[PDB]
Design a protein around this nucleic acid. Structure first.
Ligand SMILES: Nc1nc2c(ncn2[C@H]2C[C@H](O)[C@@H](COP(=O)(O)OP(=O)(O)OP(=O)(O)O)O2)c(=O)[nH]1
Ligand SMILES: [Ca+2]
Length: 579
DNA sequence: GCGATCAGC
DNA sequence: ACGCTGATCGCA
Protein backbone atom coordinates (compact mmCIF):
# COMPACT_ATOMS: atom_id res chain seq x y z
CA UNK A 1 0.00 0.00 0.00
CA UNK A 2 3.22 2.00 -0.15
CA UNK A 3 5.63 1.17 -2.97
CA UNK A 4 9.27 0.41 -2.23
CA UNK A 5 12.15 -1.68 -3.52
CA UNK A 6 12.99 -4.62 -1.25
CA UNK A 7 16.62 -4.51 -2.28
CA UNK A 8 19.08 -7.41 -2.35
CA UNK A 9 22.14 -5.19 -2.82
CA UNK A 10 23.04 -1.53 -2.35
CA UNK A 11 22.85 0.69 -5.45
CA UNK A 12 24.14 4.17 -6.24
CA UNK A 13 20.69 5.78 -6.18
CA UNK A 14 20.37 4.67 -2.53
CA UNK A 15 23.36 6.91 -1.70
CA UNK A 16 22.01 10.39 -2.52
CA UNK A 17 23.22 13.46 -0.68
CA UNK A 18 19.90 13.83 1.19
CA UNK A 19 17.77 11.00 2.55
CA UNK A 20 15.43 9.99 5.30
CA UNK A 21 17.10 7.06 7.10
CA UNK A 22 15.70 4.42 9.46
CA UNK A 23 18.15 2.07 11.21
CA UNK A 24 15.72 0.03 13.29
CA UNK A 25 16.57 -1.09 16.85
CA UNK A 26 13.58 -2.66 18.59
CA UNK A 27 15.07 -3.39 22.01
CA UNK A 28 14.44 -0.56 24.49
CA UNK A 29 18.09 -0.59 25.59
CA UNK A 30 19.89 -0.11 22.27
CA UNK A 31 23.40 -0.91 23.60
CA UNK A 32 24.81 -3.87 21.63
CA UNK A 33 21.30 -4.51 20.33
CA UNK A 34 20.40 -6.00 16.95
CA UNK A 35 19.64 -3.78 13.97
CA UNK A 36 16.62 -5.48 12.44
CA UNK A 37 16.26 -3.57 9.17
CA UNK A 38 17.08 -0.39 7.31
CA UNK A 39 15.01 1.93 5.14
CA UNK A 40 16.08 4.79 2.88
CA UNK A 41 13.75 7.33 1.26
CA UNK A 42 15.27 9.89 -1.07
CA UNK A 43 14.57 11.70 -4.34
CA UNK A 44 15.04 8.44 -6.31
CA UNK A 45 12.62 6.25 -4.40
CA UNK A 46 12.03 4.16 -1.30
CA UNK A 47 14.30 1.26 -0.33
CA UNK A 48 14.41 -1.49 2.29
CA UNK A 49 17.78 -3.09 3.02
CA UNK A 50 18.65 -6.09 5.13
CA UNK A 51 21.32 -5.05 7.68
CA UNK A 52 23.53 -8.12 7.17
CA UNK A 53 24.05 -6.97 3.58
CA UNK A 54 23.81 -3.17 3.88
CA UNK A 55 26.17 -2.86 6.85
CA UNK A 56 28.80 -5.08 5.20
CA UNK A 57 28.66 -3.08 1.96
CA UNK A 58 31.66 -0.70 1.84
CA UNK A 59 29.79 1.94 -0.19
CA UNK A 60 26.85 2.02 2.22
CA UNK A 61 29.17 2.20 5.23
CA UNK A 62 31.07 5.07 3.60
CA UNK A 63 27.79 6.88 2.90
CA UNK A 64 26.71 6.45 6.54
CA UNK A 65 29.96 8.05 7.71
CA UNK A 66 30.12 10.94 5.23
CA UNK A 67 29.10 14.16 6.99
CA UNK A 68 28.23 15.71 3.57
CA UNK A 69 25.50 13.10 2.88
CA UNK A 70 22.65 14.43 4.98
CA UNK A 71 20.25 12.13 6.80
CA UNK A 72 16.90 12.98 8.36
CA UNK A 73 16.00 10.52 11.13
CA UNK A 74 13.94 9.87 14.26
CA UNK A 75 16.01 9.22 17.42
CA UNK A 76 19.37 9.40 15.65
CA UNK A 77 21.25 8.75 18.92
CA UNK A 78 19.68 5.28 19.13
CA UNK A 79 20.85 4.51 15.57
CA UNK A 80 24.32 6.04 16.10
CA UNK A 81 25.01 4.08 19.28
CA UNK A 82 23.68 0.80 17.82
CA UNK A 83 25.93 1.38 14.79
CA UNK A 84 28.94 2.15 17.01
CA UNK A 85 28.36 -1.29 18.57
CA UNK A 86 28.59 -2.67 15.01
CA UNK A 87 31.86 -0.84 14.34
CA UNK A 88 30.20 1.76 12.06
CA UNK A 89 30.18 5.56 12.34
CA UNK A 90 27.07 7.58 11.48
CA UNK A 91 27.65 11.21 10.40
CA UNK A 92 25.64 13.85 8.60
CA UNK A 93 22.36 13.75 10.58
CA UNK A 94 20.78 17.10 9.69
CA UNK A 95 17.25 16.56 11.10
CA UNK A 96 16.02 14.51 14.07
CA UNK A 97 12.22 14.30 14.21
CA UNK A 98 12.25 13.14 17.84
CA UNK A 99 14.15 16.22 19.02
CA UNK A 100 12.07 18.52 16.82
CA UNK A 101 8.83 17.16 18.32
CA UNK A 102 10.30 17.46 21.82
CA UNK A 103 11.19 21.14 21.35
CA UNK A 104 7.74 21.96 19.92
CA UNK A 105 5.91 20.37 22.84
CA UNK A 106 7.58 18.14 25.44
CA UNK A 107 4.18 17.16 26.87
CA UNK A 108 3.21 15.16 23.78
CA UNK A 109 5.43 12.38 25.10
CA UNK A 110 6.37 11.49 21.51
CA UNK A 111 8.07 8.12 21.61
CA UNK A 112 7.68 7.04 17.98
CA UNK A 113 7.38 8.41 14.46
CA UNK A 114 3.61 7.89 14.39
CA UNK A 115 3.18 10.10 17.47
CA UNK A 116 5.26 12.89 15.92
CA UNK A 117 3.47 12.57 12.57
CA UNK A 118 0.09 12.97 14.30
CA UNK A 119 1.15 16.49 15.35
CA UNK A 120 1.04 17.52 11.66
CA UNK A 121 -2.00 15.45 10.61
CA UNK A 122 0.16 12.75 8.97
CA UNK A 123 -1.27 9.32 9.74
CA UNK A 124 0.10 7.03 6.98
CA UNK A 125 2.36 5.23 9.46
CA UNK A 126 1.63 2.89 12.29
CA UNK A 127 2.70 3.16 15.94
CA UNK A 128 5.67 0.92 16.73
CA UNK A 129 3.68 -0.80 19.48
CA UNK A 130 1.05 -1.81 16.93
CA UNK A 131 3.72 -3.41 14.74
CA UNK A 132 5.93 -5.04 17.37
CA UNK A 133 3.42 -5.86 20.11
CA UNK A 134 3.67 -5.55 23.87
CA UNK A 135 5.53 -7.35 26.63
CA UNK A 136 5.95 -11.10 26.26
CA UNK A 137 4.24 -10.96 22.84
CA UNK A 138 6.73 -8.40 21.51
CA UNK A 139 8.38 -9.64 18.33
CA UNK A 140 9.91 -8.53 15.02
CA UNK A 141 7.20 -9.25 12.42
CA UNK A 142 7.61 -11.04 9.10
CA UNK A 143 9.94 -9.26 6.69
CA UNK A 144 7.28 -7.77 4.32
CA UNK A 145 5.43 -6.34 7.32
CA UNK A 146 8.67 -5.05 8.87
CA UNK A 147 9.90 -3.55 5.61
CA UNK A 148 6.69 -1.64 4.93
CA UNK A 149 6.73 -0.24 8.48
CA UNK A 150 10.32 1.03 8.18
CA UNK A 151 9.64 2.48 4.73
CA UNK A 152 6.49 4.24 6.01
CA UNK A 153 8.44 5.68 8.95
CA UNK A 154 11.14 6.88 6.54
CA UNK A 155 8.50 8.37 4.22
CA UNK A 156 6.92 10.17 7.19
CA UNK A 157 10.27 11.68 8.22
CA UNK A 158 10.85 12.74 4.60
CA UNK A 159 7.50 14.53 4.50
CA UNK A 160 7.55 16.02 8.02
CA UNK A 161 10.92 17.81 8.14
CA UNK A 162 9.61 20.94 6.42
CA UNK A 163 6.43 21.49 8.54
CA UNK A 164 8.38 20.77 11.76
CA UNK A 165 11.17 23.18 10.76
CA UNK A 166 8.58 25.83 9.85
CA UNK A 167 6.96 25.70 13.27
CA UNK A 168 10.36 25.58 15.02
CA UNK A 169 11.32 28.72 13.11
CA UNK A 170 8.10 30.46 14.19
CA UNK A 171 8.84 29.56 17.82
CA UNK A 172 12.49 30.83 17.61
CA UNK A 173 13.61 27.22 18.16
CA UNK A 174 15.22 26.28 14.85
CA UNK A 175 18.76 27.10 16.04
CA UNK A 176 17.93 25.38 19.34
CA UNK A 177 17.36 22.20 17.30
CA UNK A 178 20.21 22.51 14.80
CA UNK A 179 22.93 24.21 16.86
CA UNK A 180 22.16 22.75 20.31
CA UNK A 181 20.08 19.56 20.58
CA UNK A 182 21.29 17.81 17.39
CA UNK A 183 25.02 18.41 18.12
CA UNK A 184 24.40 17.35 21.74
CA UNK A 185 22.84 14.09 20.57
CA UNK A 186 26.10 13.08 18.86
CA UNK A 187 28.06 13.96 22.00
CA UNK A 188 25.71 11.92 24.19
CA UNK A 189 26.09 8.97 21.78
CA UNK A 190 29.87 9.11 22.31
CA UNK A 191 29.44 9.32 26.10
CA UNK A 192 27.05 6.39 26.24
CA UNK A 193 29.18 4.21 23.98
CA UNK A 194 32.34 4.99 25.93
CA UNK A 195 30.71 3.88 29.19
CA UNK A 196 32.16 4.17 32.70
CA UNK A 197 34.46 1.51 34.10
CA UNK A 198 33.42 -0.14 37.36
CA UNK A 199 35.56 -1.90 39.99
CA UNK A 200 33.39 -4.97 40.42
CA UNK A 201 35.67 -6.49 43.05
CA UNK A 202 35.08 -3.47 45.29
CA UNK A 203 31.32 -3.45 44.67
CA UNK A 204 31.07 -7.14 45.45
CA UNK A 205 32.98 -6.76 48.72
CA UNK A 206 30.80 -3.79 49.67
CA UNK A 207 27.72 -5.91 49.01
CA UNK A 208 28.98 -8.68 51.26
CA UNK A 209 29.64 -6.19 54.07
CA UNK A 210 26.25 -4.55 53.55
CA UNK A 211 24.52 -7.92 53.84
CA UNK A 212 26.07 -8.56 57.25
CA UNK A 213 25.20 -5.08 58.54
CA UNK A 214 21.64 -5.55 57.25
CA UNK A 215 21.30 -8.69 59.38
CA UNK A 216 22.55 -6.91 62.50
CA UNK A 217 20.08 -4.05 62.03
CA UNK A 218 17.24 -6.41 61.09
CA UNK A 219 17.59 -8.30 64.38
CA UNK A 220 17.83 -5.08 66.39
CA UNK A 221 14.53 -3.96 64.85
CA UNK A 222 12.93 -7.29 65.79
CA UNK A 223 14.14 -6.89 69.39
CA UNK A 224 12.96 -3.28 69.62
CA UNK A 225 9.65 -4.36 68.08
CA UNK A 226 9.34 -7.17 70.66
CA UNK A 227 8.53 -9.45 67.71
CA UNK A 228 9.83 -10.39 64.29
CA UNK A 229 7.91 -9.20 61.23
CA UNK A 230 8.33 -8.14 57.62
CA UNK A 231 10.08 -4.77 57.96
CA UNK A 232 9.36 -4.15 54.27
CA UNK A 233 5.59 -4.67 54.69
CA UNK A 234 3.68 -1.36 55.03
CA UNK A 235 0.71 -3.11 56.62
CA UNK A 236 2.91 -4.99 59.10
CA UNK A 237 5.19 -1.99 59.74
CA UNK A 238 2.25 0.37 60.16
CA UNK A 239 0.73 -2.09 62.62
CA UNK A 240 3.98 -2.30 64.59
CA UNK A 241 4.49 1.46 64.71
CA UNK A 242 0.99 2.85 65.00
CA UNK A 243 -1.01 0.02 66.61
CA UNK A 244 1.33 -2.18 68.67
CA UNK A 245 3.76 0.57 69.66
CA UNK A 246 0.98 3.22 69.58
CA UNK A 247 3.18 5.92 68.07
CA UNK A 248 1.41 9.11 66.91
CA UNK A 249 0.00 9.11 63.39
CA UNK A 250 1.44 12.21 61.72
CA UNK A 251 0.43 11.46 58.11
CA UNK A 252 -1.59 8.98 56.05
CA UNK A 253 -1.38 7.73 52.49
CA UNK A 254 -4.25 6.77 50.22
CA UNK A 255 -3.95 3.22 51.58
CA UNK A 256 -2.76 3.61 55.18
CA UNK A 257 -0.17 5.05 57.55
CA UNK A 258 2.77 6.89 56.02
CA UNK A 259 6.25 5.76 57.02
CA UNK A 260 8.25 8.19 54.90
CA UNK A 261 11.59 9.31 56.30
CA UNK A 262 10.28 12.74 57.31
CA UNK A 263 7.58 11.04 59.41
CA UNK A 264 10.06 8.58 60.92
CA UNK A 265 12.50 11.34 61.83
CA UNK A 266 9.74 13.21 63.67
CA UNK A 267 9.00 10.05 65.71
CA UNK A 268 12.59 9.69 66.95
CA UNK A 269 11.81 11.23 70.39
CA UNK A 270 9.14 8.55 70.93
CA UNK A 271 10.96 5.30 70.13
CA UNK A 272 14.44 4.09 69.19
CA UNK A 273 13.00 1.72 66.58
CA UNK A 274 12.31 4.42 63.98
CA UNK A 275 15.93 5.44 63.51
CA UNK A 276 16.88 1.79 63.09
CA UNK A 277 14.21 1.43 60.40
CA UNK A 278 15.79 4.42 58.62
CA UNK A 279 19.24 2.83 58.82
CA UNK A 280 17.79 -0.47 57.61
CA UNK A 281 16.15 1.14 54.57
CA UNK A 282 19.26 3.13 53.62
CA UNK A 283 21.44 -0.01 53.70
CA UNK A 284 18.91 -1.98 51.67
CA UNK A 285 18.74 0.88 49.17
CA UNK A 286 22.49 0.69 48.63
CA UNK A 287 22.28 -3.09 48.33
CA UNK A 288 19.34 -3.37 45.94
CA UNK A 289 19.78 -0.32 43.67
CA UNK A 290 23.50 0.41 43.71
CA UNK A 291 25.29 -2.88 44.41
CA UNK A 292 23.04 -5.52 42.89
CA UNK A 293 21.49 -3.21 40.30
CA UNK A 294 24.86 -1.97 39.03
CA UNK A 295 26.39 -5.45 38.93
CA UNK A 296 23.43 -6.65 36.88
CA UNK A 297 24.12 -4.10 34.13
CA UNK A 298 27.91 -4.13 34.00
CA UNK A 299 29.31 -5.63 30.79
CA UNK A 300 31.50 -8.38 32.25
CA UNK A 301 34.20 -8.48 29.57
CA UNK A 302 34.98 -4.73 29.86
CA UNK A 303 33.61 -3.97 33.36
CA UNK A 304 31.82 -0.95 31.83
CA UNK A 305 28.30 0.34 32.43
CA UNK A 306 26.61 2.10 29.53
CA UNK A 307 23.77 4.39 30.60
CA UNK A 308 21.25 5.85 28.17
CA UNK A 309 20.71 9.61 28.45
CA UNK A 310 17.09 10.28 27.49
CA UNK A 311 17.25 13.61 25.69
CA UNK A 312 13.55 13.94 24.83
CA UNK A 313 11.78 13.11 28.09
CA UNK A 314 11.84 15.78 30.82
CA UNK A 315 9.41 18.69 30.70
CA UNK A 316 12.12 21.29 31.47
CA UNK A 317 14.87 20.33 29.02
CA UNK A 318 16.98 18.33 31.46
CA UNK A 319 18.37 14.95 30.53
CA UNK A 320 17.45 11.83 32.43
CA UNK A 321 19.62 8.71 32.75
CA UNK A 322 18.41 5.11 32.66
CA UNK A 323 19.58 1.49 33.17
CA UNK A 324 21.61 2.34 35.11
CA UNK A 325 20.68 5.83 36.29
CA UNK A 326 24.08 7.42 36.77
CA UNK A 327 22.58 10.77 37.84
CA UNK A 328 21.52 9.58 41.30
CA UNK A 329 24.61 7.73 42.62
CA UNK A 330 24.73 8.26 46.43
CA UNK A 331 26.82 11.11 47.84
CA UNK A 332 25.23 12.66 50.91
CA UNK A 333 25.78 9.95 53.54
CA UNK A 334 29.30 8.68 54.03
CA UNK A 335 28.56 4.97 53.62
CA UNK A 336 26.55 5.61 50.45
CA UNK A 337 29.17 7.92 48.96
CA UNK A 338 31.70 5.07 49.02
CA UNK A 339 29.86 3.49 46.07
CA UNK A 340 31.62 6.19 44.02
CA UNK A 341 34.95 4.53 44.86
CA UNK A 342 33.87 1.77 42.45
CA UNK A 343 33.69 4.21 39.50
CA UNK A 344 37.18 4.27 37.99
CA UNK A 345 39.00 5.53 34.89
CA UNK A 346 38.86 3.26 31.90
CA UNK A 347 42.65 3.27 31.35
CA UNK A 348 45.62 3.00 33.66
CA UNK A 349 47.24 6.35 34.54
CA UNK A 350 44.00 8.17 33.66
CA UNK A 351 41.98 10.08 36.26
CA UNK A 352 38.40 11.29 36.82
CA UNK A 353 37.76 15.05 36.53
CA UNK A 354 34.49 16.59 37.79
CA UNK A 355 33.23 20.17 37.42
CA UNK A 356 29.99 21.69 38.75
CA UNK A 357 28.22 25.04 38.40
CA UNK A 358 27.98 26.80 41.78
CA UNK A 359 24.45 27.84 42.83
CA UNK A 360 23.38 27.57 39.21
CA UNK A 361 19.63 28.15 39.37
CA UNK A 362 19.97 31.08 41.80
CA UNK A 363 22.43 32.78 39.41
CA UNK A 364 20.04 32.17 36.50
CA UNK A 365 17.15 33.52 38.55
CA UNK A 366 19.15 36.66 39.43
CA UNK A 367 19.77 37.29 35.73
CA UNK A 368 16.23 36.61 34.55
CA UNK A 369 14.47 38.38 37.44
CA UNK A 370 17.05 41.22 37.44
CA UNK A 371 16.80 41.35 41.22
CA UNK A 372 19.28 44.06 42.27
CA UNK A 373 20.13 42.44 45.60
CA UNK A 374 20.49 38.89 44.25
CA UNK A 375 22.63 40.12 41.37
CA UNK A 376 24.84 42.07 43.80
CA UNK A 377 25.15 38.91 45.97
CA UNK A 378 26.59 36.88 43.09
CA UNK A 379 28.75 39.79 41.96
CA UNK A 380 30.26 39.52 45.46
CA UNK A 381 30.65 35.72 45.00
CA UNK A 382 28.45 35.18 48.05
CA UNK A 383 27.30 31.67 48.93
CA UNK A 384 23.55 32.15 49.33
CA UNK A 385 23.03 28.59 50.59
CA UNK A 386 25.57 29.13 53.36
CA UNK A 387 24.12 32.59 54.06
CA UNK A 388 20.64 31.11 54.42
CA UNK A 389 21.90 28.30 56.67
CA UNK A 390 23.51 30.88 58.95
CA UNK A 391 20.17 32.69 59.25
CA UNK A 392 18.08 29.52 59.62
CA UNK A 393 20.17 27.70 62.24
CA UNK A 394 21.40 30.94 63.90
CA UNK A 395 25.08 30.00 63.55
CA UNK A 396 28.20 31.65 62.21
CA UNK A 397 29.78 30.84 58.85
CA UNK A 398 32.38 28.58 60.49
CA UNK A 399 29.76 26.34 62.08
CA UNK A 400 27.69 25.59 58.95
CA UNK A 401 27.88 21.81 58.34
CA UNK A 402 27.43 19.99 55.02
CA UNK A 403 23.94 18.98 56.16
CA UNK A 404 22.83 22.42 57.30
CA UNK A 405 23.87 23.82 53.93
CA UNK A 406 21.99 21.10 52.07
CA UNK A 407 18.96 21.94 54.21
CA UNK A 408 19.26 25.67 53.47
CA UNK A 409 19.44 24.69 49.80
CA UNK A 410 15.94 23.19 50.01
CA UNK A 411 14.76 26.36 51.80
CA UNK A 412 16.22 28.65 49.12
CA UNK A 413 14.71 26.76 46.20
CA UNK A 414 11.51 26.06 48.12
CA UNK A 415 10.82 29.73 48.69
CA UNK A 416 11.53 30.95 45.18
CA UNK A 417 9.47 28.11 43.65
CA UNK A 418 6.38 28.72 45.77
CA UNK A 419 6.67 26.71 49.01
CA UNK A 420 3.94 27.59 51.52
CA UNK A 421 4.35 28.51 55.18
CA UNK A 422 3.02 25.05 56.02
CA UNK A 423 5.54 23.21 53.86
CA UNK A 424 8.45 25.31 55.10
CA UNK A 425 7.46 24.80 58.75
CA UNK A 426 7.19 21.04 58.21
CA UNK A 427 10.69 21.01 56.65
CA UNK A 428 12.49 23.06 59.30
CA UNK A 429 10.40 21.72 62.21
CA UNK A 430 9.54 25.31 63.13
CA UNK A 431 6.25 26.99 63.85
CA UNK A 432 4.03 27.93 60.94
CA UNK A 433 4.00 31.63 61.79
CA UNK A 434 7.81 31.57 62.05
CA UNK A 435 7.90 30.06 58.55
CA UNK A 436 5.54 32.70 57.13
CA UNK A 437 7.55 35.58 58.57
CA UNK A 438 10.76 34.07 57.22
CA UNK A 439 9.24 33.89 53.73
CA UNK A 440 8.08 37.51 54.07
CA UNK A 441 11.58 38.57 55.16
CA UNK A 442 13.02 36.63 52.21
CA UNK A 443 10.96 38.54 49.67
CA UNK A 444 11.81 41.83 51.42
CA UNK A 445 15.45 41.14 50.55
CA UNK A 446 14.62 39.95 47.01
CA UNK A 447 11.56 41.96 45.84
CA UNK A 448 12.62 41.57 42.21
CA UNK A 449 12.36 37.79 42.59
CA UNK A 450 8.84 38.21 43.98
CA UNK A 451 7.87 40.53 41.10
CA UNK A 452 9.30 38.08 38.60
CA UNK A 453 7.28 35.20 40.01
CA UNK A 454 4.08 37.27 39.83
CA UNK A 455 4.86 38.46 36.29
CA UNK A 456 5.81 35.07 34.87
CA UNK A 457 2.53 33.55 36.05
CA UNK A 458 0.62 36.33 34.29
CA UNK A 459 2.74 35.86 31.17
CA UNK A 460 2.01 32.12 31.17
CA UNK A 461 -1.72 32.92 31.41
CA UNK A 462 -1.51 35.39 28.52
CA UNK A 463 0.65 33.35 26.14
CA UNK A 464 -0.30 29.80 27.20
CA UNK A 465 3.35 28.78 27.72
CA UNK A 466 6.66 29.77 29.31
CA UNK A 467 10.12 29.78 27.74
CA UNK A 468 13.78 29.48 28.71
CA UNK A 469 16.76 31.62 27.72
CA UNK A 470 17.52 29.59 24.57
CA UNK A 471 13.77 29.44 23.69
CA UNK A 472 12.77 26.03 25.02
CA UNK A 473 9.00 25.97 25.58
CA UNK A 474 6.48 24.40 27.97
CA UNK A 475 2.73 24.82 27.52
CA UNK A 476 0.73 25.25 30.73
CA UNK A 477 -2.99 24.91 29.90
CA UNK A 478 -3.82 24.24 33.57
CA UNK A 479 -2.70 27.76 34.54
CA UNK A 480 -6.30 28.91 33.81
CA UNK A 481 -7.99 25.92 35.45
CA UNK A 482 -11.00 26.59 37.67
CA UNK A 483 -9.71 24.07 40.23
CA UNK A 484 -7.50 25.88 42.73
CA UNK A 485 -5.14 22.94 43.24
CA UNK A 486 -4.73 22.19 39.53
CA UNK A 487 -4.11 25.87 38.82
CA UNK A 488 -1.63 26.13 41.72
CA UNK A 489 0.60 23.28 40.48
CA UNK A 490 0.68 25.02 37.09
CA UNK A 491 1.69 28.37 38.61
CA UNK A 492 4.65 26.74 40.34
CA UNK A 493 5.60 25.18 36.99
CA UNK A 494 5.55 28.65 35.44
CA UNK A 495 7.84 29.80 38.29
CA UNK A 496 10.32 26.90 38.04
CA UNK A 497 10.51 25.81 34.37
CA UNK A 498 12.15 28.96 32.92
CA UNK A 499 14.86 28.72 35.59
CA UNK A 500 15.56 24.99 35.64
CA UNK A 501 15.20 24.89 31.85
CA UNK A 502 17.60 27.78 31.29
CA UNK A 503 20.18 26.01 33.50
CA UNK A 504 19.65 22.93 31.31
CA UNK A 505 20.20 25.08 28.19
CA UNK A 506 23.47 26.47 29.56
CA UNK A 507 25.09 23.16 30.45
CA UNK A 508 24.11 21.68 27.07
CA UNK A 509 25.85 24.57 25.30
CA UNK A 510 28.81 24.10 27.65
CA UNK A 511 29.11 20.45 26.60
CA UNK A 512 29.17 21.37 22.89
CA UNK A 513 31.76 24.13 23.49
CA UNK A 514 33.85 21.80 25.65
CA UNK A 515 34.02 19.04 23.03
CA UNK A 516 35.07 21.58 20.38
CA UNK A 517 37.82 22.90 22.65
CA UNK A 518 39.07 19.42 23.59
CA UNK A 519 39.36 18.61 19.88
CA UNK A 520 41.11 21.91 19.09
CA UNK A 521 43.71 21.22 21.81
CA UNK A 522 44.06 17.59 20.59
CA UNK A 523 43.44 16.25 24.08
CA UNK A 524 42.50 12.65 24.86
CA UNK A 525 40.17 13.81 27.67
CA UNK A 526 36.51 13.04 27.05
CA UNK A 527 33.11 13.40 28.68
CA UNK A 528 31.63 10.46 30.59
CA UNK A 529 28.56 11.86 32.37
CA UNK A 530 26.33 14.89 32.76
CA UNK A 531 24.54 15.26 36.10
CA UNK A 532 22.25 18.28 35.37
CA UNK A 533 24.75 21.01 36.31
CA UNK A 534 27.87 18.85 36.56
CA UNK A 535 30.20 17.33 33.95
CA UNK A 536 32.33 14.23 34.62
CA UNK A 537 35.33 13.49 32.38
CA UNK A 538 38.27 11.12 32.30
CA UNK A 539 41.72 11.92 30.93
CA UNK A 540 45.38 10.89 31.16
CA UNK A 541 46.97 12.25 34.32
CA UNK A 542 49.29 14.30 32.10
CA UNK A 543 46.26 16.36 30.94
CA UNK A 544 44.86 17.30 34.38
CA UNK A 545 46.68 20.60 34.83
CA UNK A 546 45.54 21.84 31.42
CA UNK A 547 41.99 20.66 32.15
CA UNK A 548 41.89 22.58 35.45
CA UNK A 549 42.08 25.74 33.35
CA UNK A 550 40.24 24.57 30.23
CA UNK A 551 37.03 23.03 31.60
CA UNK A 552 35.98 25.73 34.14
CA UNK A 553 36.65 28.45 31.55
CA UNK A 554 34.54 26.80 28.82
CA UNK A 555 31.70 26.22 31.29
CA UNK A 556 31.89 29.75 32.72
CA UNK A 557 31.86 31.28 29.23
CA UNK A 558 29.08 29.13 27.75
CA UNK A 559 26.73 32.14 28.09
CA UNK A 560 27.15 35.70 29.35
CA UNK A 561 24.67 36.62 32.09
CA UNK A 562 24.25 39.72 34.23
CA UNK A 563 26.10 37.79 36.98
CA UNK A 564 29.21 35.62 36.74
CA UNK A 565 28.97 31.89 36.38
CA UNK A 566 31.23 30.01 38.79
CA UNK A 567 32.53 26.45 38.44
CA UNK A 568 33.90 24.18 41.17
CA UNK A 569 36.12 21.30 40.03
CA UNK A 570 38.17 18.39 41.37
CA UNK A 571 39.97 15.33 40.06
CA UNK A 572 41.15 12.02 41.45
CA UNK A 573 41.69 8.33 40.85
CA UNK A 574 38.01 7.45 41.36
CA UNK A 575 34.76 9.39 41.16
CA UNK A 576 34.82 9.38 44.97
CA UNK A 577 38.14 11.23 44.93
CA UNK A 578 37.01 13.83 42.40
CA UNK A 579 35.46 16.01 45.11
C1' DG B 1 1.08 -1.83 36.87
C1' DC B 2 0.88 1.59 40.48
C1' DG B 3 2.09 4.18 44.51
C1' DA B 4 5.07 4.95 48.26
C1' DT B 5 9.54 5.55 49.09
C1' DC B 6 14.16 7.32 48.46
C1' DA B 7 18.60 8.01 45.62
C1' DG B 8 20.26 12.46 42.97
C1' DC B 9 20.39 17.61 40.89
C1' DA C 1 0.91 22.72 50.66
C1' DC C 2 8.89 24.14 46.11
C1' DG C 3 10.60 21.67 40.99
C1' DC C 4 12.74 17.84 37.75
C1' DT C 5 13.79 12.80 37.63
C1' DG C 6 14.55 6.63 37.90
C1' DA C 7 14.66 2.09 40.53
C1' DT C 8 12.89 -0.91 43.80
C1' DC C 9 9.33 -3.68 45.74
C1' DG C 10 4.91 -4.76 48.24
C1' DC C 11 0.41 -4.63 47.03
C1' DA C 12 -4.03 -1.49 52.32
N1 LIG D 1 13.20 23.10 43.18
C1 LIG D 1 14.42 22.48 43.66
N2 LIG D 1 15.48 22.46 42.88
C2 LIG D 1 16.64 21.91 43.28
C3 LIG D 1 16.75 21.35 44.54
N3 LIG D 1 18.01 20.88 44.67
C4 LIG D 1 18.65 21.15 43.54
N4 LIG D 1 17.84 21.76 42.68
C5 LIG D 1 18.15 22.29 41.38
C6 LIG D 1 18.42 23.62 41.55
C7 LIG D 1 19.89 23.73 41.79
O1 LIG D 1 20.49 24.99 41.61
C8 LIG D 1 20.35 22.69 40.72
C9 LIG D 1 21.77 22.19 41.09
O2 LIG D 1 21.67 21.55 42.32
P1 LIG D 1 22.96 21.59 43.34
O3 LIG D 1 22.78 20.56 44.43
O4 LIG D 1 24.23 21.41 42.57
O5 LIG D 1 22.86 23.02 44.11
P2 LIG D 1 23.48 24.47 43.59
O6 LIG D 1 24.01 24.47 42.18
O7 LIG D 1 22.38 25.48 43.72
O8 LIG D 1 24.58 24.80 44.71
P3 LIG D 1 26.09 24.24 44.90
O9 LIG D 1 26.53 23.49 43.67
O10 LIG D 1 26.12 23.41 46.15
O11 LIG D 1 26.87 25.51 45.05
O12 LIG D 1 19.51 21.71 40.84
C10 LIG D 1 15.60 21.41 45.35
O13 LIG D 1 15.62 20.86 46.63
N5 LIG D 1 14.48 21.96 44.88
CA1 LIG E 1 25.83 22.91 41.57
Amino acid sequence: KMAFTLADRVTEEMLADKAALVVEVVEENYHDAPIVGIAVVNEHGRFFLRPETALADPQFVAWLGDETKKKSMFDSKRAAVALKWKGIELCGVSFDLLLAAYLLDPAQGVDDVAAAAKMKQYEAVRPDEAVYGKGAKRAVPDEPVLAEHLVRKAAAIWELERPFLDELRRNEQDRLLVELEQPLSSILAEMEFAGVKVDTKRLEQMGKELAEQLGTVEQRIYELAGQEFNINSPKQLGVILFEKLQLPVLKKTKTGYSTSADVLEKLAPYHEIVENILHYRQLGKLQSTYIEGLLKVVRPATKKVHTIFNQALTQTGRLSSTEPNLQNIPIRLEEGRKIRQAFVPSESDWLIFAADYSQIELRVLAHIAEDDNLMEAFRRDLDIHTKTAMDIFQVSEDEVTPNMRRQAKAVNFGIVYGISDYGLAQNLNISRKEAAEFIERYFESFPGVKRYMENIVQEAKQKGYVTTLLHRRRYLPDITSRNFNVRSFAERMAMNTPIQGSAADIIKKAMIDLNARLKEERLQAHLLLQVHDELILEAPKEEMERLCRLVPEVMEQAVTLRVPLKVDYHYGSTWYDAK
